Design an enzyme around this catalytic site. Sequence first.
Site, PDB file in Angstrom:
ATOM      1  NE  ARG A   1      -2.427   3.488   1.170  1.00  0.00           N
ATOM      2  CZ  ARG A   1      -2.482   4.727   1.650  1.00  0.00           C
ATOM      3  NH1 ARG A   1      -1.738   5.104   2.697  1.00  0.00           N
ATOM      4  NH2 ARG A   1      -3.301   5.597   1.072  1.00  0.00           N
TER       5      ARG A   1
ATOM      6  CB  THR B   1      22.746  -9.594  -2.630  1.00  0.00           C
ATOM      7  OG1 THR B   1      23.617  -8.496  -2.953  1.00  0.00           O
ATOM      8  CG2 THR B   1      22.746  -9.794  -1.109  1.00  0.00           C
TER       9      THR B   1
ATOM     10  CD  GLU C   1      26.694  -4.979  -1.646  1.00  0.00           C
ATOM     11  OE1 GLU C   1      27.247  -4.954  -2.773  1.00  0.00           O
ATOM     12  OE2 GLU C   1      27.112  -4.314  -0.665  1.00  0.00           O
TER      13      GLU C   1
ATOM     14  CE1 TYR D   1      19.704  -5.639   0.207  1.00  0.00           C
ATOM     15  CE2 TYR D   1      22.053  -5.982  -0.216  1.00  0.00           C
ATOM     16  CZ  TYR D   1      20.708  -6.128  -0.590  1.00  0.00           C
ATOM     17  OH  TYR D   1      20.360  -6.760  -1.754  1.00  0.00           O
TER      18      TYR D   1
ATOM     19  CE  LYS E   1      18.148  -8.924  -0.046  1.00  0.00           C
ATOM     20  NZ  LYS E   1      17.056  -9.665  -0.737  1.00  0.00           N
TER      21      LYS E   1
END
Lengths: 355, 351, 351, 351
Positions: free
Chosen positions: C35, C134, C136, C158, C162
């Site tokens: 939303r 990823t 990363e 991050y 992950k």
Amino acid sequence: LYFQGRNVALITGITGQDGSYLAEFLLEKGYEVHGIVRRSSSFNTGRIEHLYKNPQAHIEGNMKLHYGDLTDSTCLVKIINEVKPTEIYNLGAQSHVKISFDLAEYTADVDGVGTLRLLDAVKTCGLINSVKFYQASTSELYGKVQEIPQKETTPFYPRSPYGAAKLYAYWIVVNFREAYNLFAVNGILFNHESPRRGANFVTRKISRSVAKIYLGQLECFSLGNLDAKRDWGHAKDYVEAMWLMLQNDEPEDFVIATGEVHSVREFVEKSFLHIGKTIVWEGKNENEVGRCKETGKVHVTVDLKYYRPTEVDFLQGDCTKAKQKLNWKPRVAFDELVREMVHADVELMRTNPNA
Amino acid sequence: GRNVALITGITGQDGSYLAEFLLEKGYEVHGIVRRSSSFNTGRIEHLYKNPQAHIEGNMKLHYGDLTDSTCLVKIINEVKPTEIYNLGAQSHVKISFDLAEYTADVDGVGTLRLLDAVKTCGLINSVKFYQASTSELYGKVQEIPQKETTPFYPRSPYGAAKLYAYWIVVNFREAYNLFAVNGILFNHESPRRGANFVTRKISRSVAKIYLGQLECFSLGNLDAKRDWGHAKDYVEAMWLMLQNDEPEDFVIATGEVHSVREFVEKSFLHIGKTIVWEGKNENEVGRCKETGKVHVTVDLKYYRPTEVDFLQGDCTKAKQKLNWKPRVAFDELVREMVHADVELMRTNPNA
Amino acid sequence: GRNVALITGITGQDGSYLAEFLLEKGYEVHGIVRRSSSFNTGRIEHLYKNPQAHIEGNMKLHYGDLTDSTCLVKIINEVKPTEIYNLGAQSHVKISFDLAEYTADVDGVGTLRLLDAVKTCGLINSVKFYQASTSELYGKVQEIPQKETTPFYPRSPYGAAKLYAYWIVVNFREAYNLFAVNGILFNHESPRRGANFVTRKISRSVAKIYLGQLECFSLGNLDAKRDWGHAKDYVEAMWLMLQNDEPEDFVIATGEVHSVREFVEKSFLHIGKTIVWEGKNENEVGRCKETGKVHVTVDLKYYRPTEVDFLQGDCTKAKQKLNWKPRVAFDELVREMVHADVELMRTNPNA
Amino acid sequence: GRNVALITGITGQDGSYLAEFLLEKGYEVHGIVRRSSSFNTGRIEHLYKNPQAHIEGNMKLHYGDLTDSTCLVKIINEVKPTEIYNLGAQSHVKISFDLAEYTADVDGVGTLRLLDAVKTCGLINSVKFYQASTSELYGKVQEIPQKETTPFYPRSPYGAAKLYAYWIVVNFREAYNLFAVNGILFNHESPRRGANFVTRKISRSVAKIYLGQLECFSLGNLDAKRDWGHAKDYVEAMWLMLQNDEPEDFVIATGEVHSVREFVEKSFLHIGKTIVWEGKNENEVGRCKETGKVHVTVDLKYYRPTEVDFLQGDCTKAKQKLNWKPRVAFDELVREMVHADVELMRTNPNA
Ligand SMILES: NC(=O)c1ccc[n+]([C@@H]2O[C@H](COP(=O)([O-])OP(=O)(O)OC[C@H]3O[C@@H](n4cnc5c(N)ncnc54)[C@H](OP(=O)(O)O)[C@@H]3O)[C@@H](O)[C@H]2O)c1
Ligand SMILES: NC(=O)c1ccc[n+]([C@@H]2O[C@H](COP(=O)([O-])OP(=O)(O)OC[C@H]3O[C@@H](n4cnc5c(N)ncnc54)[C@H](OP(=O)(O)O)[C@@H]3O)[C@@H](O)[C@H]2O)c1
Ligand SMILES: NC(=O)c1ccc[n+]([C@@H]2O[C@H](COP(=O)([O-])OP(=O)(O)OC[C@H]3O[C@@H](n4cnc5c(N)ncnc54)[C@H](OP(=O)(O)O)[C@@H]3O)[C@@H](O)[C@H]2O)c1
Ligand SMILES: NC(=O)c1ccc[n+]([C@@H]2O[C@H](COP(=O)([O-])OP(=O)(O)OC[C@H]3O[C@@H](n4cnc5c(N)ncnc54)[C@H](OP(=O)(O)O)[C@@H]3O)[C@@H](O)[C@H]2O)c1
Ligand SMILES: Nc1nc2c(ncn2[C@@H]2O[C@H](COP(=O)(O)OP(=O)(O)O[C@H]3O[C@@H](C(F)(F)F)[C@@H](O)[C@@H](O)[C@@H]3O)[C@@H](O)[C@H]2O)c(=O)[nH]1
Ligand SMILES: Nc1nc2c(ncn2[C@@H]2O[C@H](COP(=O)(O)OP(=O)(O)O[C@H]3O[C@@H](C(F)(F)F)[C@@H](O)[C@@H](O)[C@@H]3O)[C@@H](O)[C@H]2O)c(=O)[nH]1
Ligand SMILES: Nc1nc2c(ncn2[C@@H]2O[C@H](COP(=O)(O)OP(=O)(O)O[C@H]3O[C@@H](C(F)(F)F)[C@@H](O)[C@@H](O)[C@@H]3O)[C@@H](O)[C@H]2O)c(=O)[nH]1
Ligand SMILES: Nc1nc2c(ncn2[C@@H]2O[C@H](COP(=O)(O)OP(=O)(O)O[C@H]3O[C@@H](C(F)(F)F)[C@@H](O)[C@@H](O)[C@@H]3O)[C@@H](O)[C@H]2O)c(=O)[nH]1
Ligand SMILES: Nc1nc2c(ncn2[C@@H]2O[C@H](COP(=O)(O)OP(=O)(O)O)[C@@H](O)[C@H]2O)c(=O)[nH]1
Ligand SMILES: Nc1nc2c(ncn2[C@@H]2O[C@H](COP(=O)(O)OP(=O)(O)O)[C@@H](O)[C@H]2O)c(=O)[nH]1
Ligand SMILES: Nc1nc2c(ncn2[C@@H]2O[C@H](COP(=O)(O)OP(=O)(O)O)[C@@H](O)[C@H]2O)c(=O)[nH]1
Ligand SMILES: Nc1nc2c(ncn2[C@@H]2O[C@H](COP(=O)(O)OP(=O)(O)O)[C@@H](O)[C@H]2O)c(=O)[nH]1
């Protein structure tokens, strides 16, 4: 599978004061009773361990316990899906008002959003038409009381993060009832106590401290607001009202209370009388002390650290609706409640002074 | 002499008008913006100092989220606002039934997180805090019209979350003397309103029908009644509530009630079509009288499980203490929204 | 057999290409959309059956959030997908330092919530699950080049989130026999890449400079070295990983390394400018040889506290087992991004 | 100088021994305790200045929860600790499979919340932070023995959450120069160990059998192999790591491996019983050689879906840099635990 004659209760908060009496009450009626227990570094089952089939081996019979937490949605769905209860009693909560001011977000997550998580688990499991749901609402919802006495139609005015979280829970329960036709009810219970009451609620703190003074383990204890007035009942009577509300033909909310008001000061006075001491008050505000008339020793002081930032000064419940529809009536009055709690704490403190 | 506003929900309808209103008064305006895979700043990108380079002037934006306590503390410490407007929310009632826990976390607990951040940052006695409360709190209304003393009766997970927020704001005011107020605002709309709220849905669809980009659209409950004002008038009330000598909660409303059906009818009249209805319940359809073409249908998927049938606000207290009064009335609101969406849909049939 | 995909993160760069790729193969494609106060579907709105009315055909969208367990169970129970691609994430490394807890909740615990929803729905033996892992994860690289067996060393919130997601996917695979795979994808870009990732920031700014809408822009660490592929090639690898007989993890990469400086140089060449560097560290600037104008500066606010200096993927395993090979190399990627952004910025200088 | 420790998880096994250790060293010791419906302070109540009145002296307790950011900031801001030991956790591996999200929120994200509170409070430069990492990180061991540089391979939601915590601690160390270390401790036990960890389950059950209060008990995987030390020795290592001049991560272990089966056999020997094994897999039983009675059975409900078969730690680095060595070896550990549980069960058959 569900069938008529199979009564299976799922109690969140089964290790707490109310959960422990409710488990006993339902077992006596032949229910299979399941409870959700938090993981803790030491067992937290002390109030219900006598309900094991073998309490020496901690082997379960008709009371079956499951690790979970009201903040973990997946664990609630797994438990409800395995148990398939006919009745759910949501008694689990961070239930202490003063602590809620310093733990406001945790209290919101457990007491407010946790109720939604439990209702959502019922719906996820497809059980909306199979289960009856009892929400442990509270006279704290009336907070700064808008009417005296308070009844089901008295507007709410909460005065703590606990009260606000429970107000969310109250209304999310109404919304599941109205939106999805869940048989879900709010028990608006006024304060109820017992020898199993948490030790830092005011009644149990007094009875424990009076017992320790009686035995010479303590000389003095401190309270906060001596003038707070409360409607105090016995937890064992009130869990029966919870069950009666789920026996009702229609899902309705009810106030459960004694309708009789006493002050903290009076609870202190009556408790000390049970160990043969008459307390005389002197001073005012944070310098007020309670002195033994016989010996002249100060036994009660006031400490502002126990005050709440927004106090609930006065509660008095009108349970006319419950008396008419449920035929519920309290059986323990205030004076017996005080005697029972002091007597039980004297025995406890005799056995273990570190208790 | 220091006027520094921090607006959560700055990218939304109200935040965009409030930002403009405060900038016009010389505030430094800070906003909290959600990280999004595409920028969500379309309503406010004209308030960059250089809108082609997205370089900030007196409106400054900060990544954050009402579910992340540490980021709120970090932003409030950096900004040191004098006024905080908590407009950020999952604000859609129908979506709140499927996203009930997220709505609780943002709209209810998120308000507590922001108040706790104010307290954590030492600002409890300096900042003024505005909470975006809502007529949805009245839900199944217990009085007509509704005023500050009308009891609340929420009817959705959005209403219940906003009720938590209402009372936690009161508790911070009462417990810690925070200047914190609830604006109990009735529905307010504009050409910037979210497209899936009923008024903007109607004006967008009627615009597309006028331009021949669409033939028909579906609604839910046509007989829902609402008190609709213009968002640009209402953000002024928010500011007025923080200018008040004492922190008080206020209803803000027009006091005039119209149905969804009337909004449809008046919107179509603006493009030259008279809607006549036929059928009942989910089989009701709206037909252009002049052409015989069906343009409106009903789909039960847009109904809410527990509807709010009727809202009508009584803002006597705000009129008397804030001198607030609405400027845009219902007929002008409909005309404005239909005209603005015709201009938008002309530029882009996929808009 | 049934081919029904559920894509979280369908509105993002990769989701938009994956949806196109799967629709071409005849899948029914379902996506989870947050939303938002404005619609966030711009990358996929062309996949509506009627883009003027936003009516769905074979791509169906559902409101949800990776932090709302109940919503995820409801969507998975309705959709009953055969393949789930978990692409939804707070995917920006720099923003993760300011939004560390939100990033953990969405990127780490959200993967667990999706896996738990699969299990709750009874689909653990009936769905194939792709996790968007990823490069990363390699952060401070422990091997050069990096392959599936290279030990991880994350360097941001991050990366940490992950890495939790990587291992909880492995645990569901090993504990419950879920067909679940980690795609360890190296950086991939496109004209749909988020504007504040370095490649798209450069291509957008070079386009604006060409059009006279911008004079200069600032970057962070010019010496960072990356393995950059095209997102359109890489979503095919995601699909190939779920076509594999056994659930295996795969590195997907080009194996070719370029610096941010090189990406800048090559981008400016596509607008006919030769960038020449002068100065060092935070004082380094890039100047156009032909005009003498400064177009690139360095701003320390774009540095990361713990940089990832160098990434280079070894995708031998995927070439051997999936017959996957990238079709777009660095020079063509740059040309395509600059060309697409000049077109976009000509139509809208505020884009 | 000032020596003020803040211990999360102070009510647990290690927290209780660490509190004793630091009080003996002259620290002011603060602890975070969860609100519980009965007091959870049984392991540390002897550390009150007056244990009959529960009056505090040099150990001070504070209500809090690792999932409540505001409460952590308030406590840390009030205490201003010089050392923080993050021992608080859902620490049970089997329970973590049923409570995966809760375990992530407390053990993973909770570590971030505590680190962010240090930063919020301005203490990044004045506190040393110990993280309670674990040999469960090695899971399916990638090296034998396991040392600081052995790559992790977690095998449970507990392992995955602790892996997040490990790397977020590294990231605060590297990004913000926080003195923050991971103690990678192998299994450590004591008479205070939680009753449903395998060593304490065995010693409790052998004690109850000795006293005739239990006939038999069930275990899961008898063949699991562990490196078991004594918790009292290991909390000293935690303190030694924060005395180090540089923040480094350390493995703390004995390097000696024994099986659950051996723990059972040695425990029964201490009560004068020789266990002999018959049968295989879930039908294996342990029988008293002397009396022929079955005392040990196997129940698959105690198996983990992804077992950790073998752990053996190499603490060379701690021995060199910290001069740490374990005092209690396996045989004495077993003896101490069985003797303590016999003494406990004599006093209370329901204990
Ligand atoms: N007693 C009153 O006067 C009164 C009046 C009205 C309403 N209430 C409400 O009635 C209910 C029971 O009251 P009580 O006196 O029995 O309270 P209590 O003794 O404090 O019991 C609280 C229970 O909730 C459990 N709990 C706490 N956090 C939990 C979580 N995150 N997940 C799952 N379970 C959790 C506790 O477990 P631990 O044992 O692990 O802490 C305990 O079992 C509560 O909801 C209380 O708010 C009480
Ligand atoms: N308009 C009305 O009739 C009305 C009536 C009474 C009260 N309200 C309340 O008034 C406020 C503003 O109304 P509006 O019409 O301006 O709503 P809106 O257009 O939906 O704007 C909502 C704002 O909140 C932001 N937001 C959503 N989730 C968030 C999160 N997790 N963290 C931070 N920010 C978040 C949105 O960001 P994105 O752009 O990233 O989605 C957007 O900026 C809301 O609280 C609404 O509930 C509205
Ligand atoms: N591109 C790369 O080089 C690369 C390399 C390896 C791995 N990855 C990972 O690959 C995946 C896709 O990459 P991308 O470049 O397509 O990222 P992106 O463009 O940033 O798309 C992110 C997507 O996740 C959605 N999302 C964010 N928070 C969410 C939440 N709380 N609940 C549900 N959905 C949410 C976003 O929705 P909004 O549109 O509403 O923000 C958007 O759809 C991500 O997991 C990313 O971390 C990317
Ligand atoms: N013992 C080992 O072999 C071993 C090996 C390596 C690492 N570890 C790690 O070492 C640390 C201590 O181990 P232990 O054996 O002492 O574990 P423990 O006895 O289980 O103690 C766990 C502690 O954390 C507290 N806690 C749990 N949830 C919490 C929450 N949400 N917020 C705040 N506090 C919370 C518990 O409080 P309650 O008392 O209220 O439950 C208790 O104080 C843990 O992090 C564990 O994972 C243990
Ligand atoms: N068995 C036991 N009883 C306790 C303990 N602490 C207090 N009491 C008894 O509780 C009653 C009320 O005392 P209180 O001060 O009103 O209770 P609080 O919960 O507000 O505060 C208590 O918090 C403790 C906690 F550790 F939780 F933070 C400690 O800080 C303790 O010192 C403090 O009293 C009285 O009868 C006490 O005897 C304890 O650890 N074990
Ligand atoms: N620009 C744009 N407009 C849209 C989009 N979807 C609907 N509308 C316009 O919104 C108005 C209201 O339509 P609605 O159906 O009442 O809106 P909802 O939000 O309830 O449902 C919409 O959700 C979308 C989402 F992706 F978010 F799930 C899609 O499923 C879409 O098909 C659906 O209409 C109208 O004017 C539409 O034109 C879109 O992606 N981009
Ligand atoms: N359409 C659009 N583009 C934008 C906007 N902001 C930046 N860019 C373009 O993005 C690219 C990268 O710029 P950046 O500064 O590296 O991006 P960041 O996301 O780190 O920072 C941006 O944050 C914004 C946010 F509101 F999200 F906080 C604002 O503060 C903005 O001023 C700032 O640039 C460039 O091409 C920009 O043109 C915007 O609101 N709308
Ligand atoms: N004092 C005490 N000891 C207990 C209790 N339950 C088990 N034990 C002792 O714990 C040791 C290990 O037993 P386990 O079965 O391996 O332990 P678990 O924690 O996996 O499971 C226990 O969970 C309980 C809980 F309530 F938490 F769910 C109950 O269901 C219980 O029946 C079950 O054993 C043994 O030495 C036991 O004596 C208890 O309530 N009070
Ligand atoms: N818990 C507690 N309450 C106190 C104390 N002194 C006074 N009170 C008052 O006693 C009343 C009942 O408190 P409590 O037993 O915690 O139950 P409550 O009604 O849920 O707040 C409240 O008004 C308290 O403010 C004290 O030392 N502890
Ligand atoms: N959003 C929306 N609302 C509708 C629709 N059809 C009827 N309504 C009614 O319009 C009223 C106002 O809805 P909305 O604009 O979403 O604002 P609300 O007052 O906050 O629910 C509500 O009673 C809806 O049930 C529709 O298609 N979409
Ligand atoms: N996002 C971004 N990255 C930059 C910038 N300047 C240099 N870089 C570097 O470019 C590399 C790639 O960054 P990014 O595109 O965000 O993708 P990442 O590999 O996931 O961090 C990183 O080493 C960045 O530090 C900048 O202005 N923005
Ligand atoms: N807790 C527990 N572990 C058992 C049991 N039977 C075998 N084990 C094994 O004992 C080993 C150590 O378990 P535990 O004491 O819980 O500590 P852990 O190493 O962190 O899993 C694990 O490999 C378990 O699978 C049992 O009944 N309970």
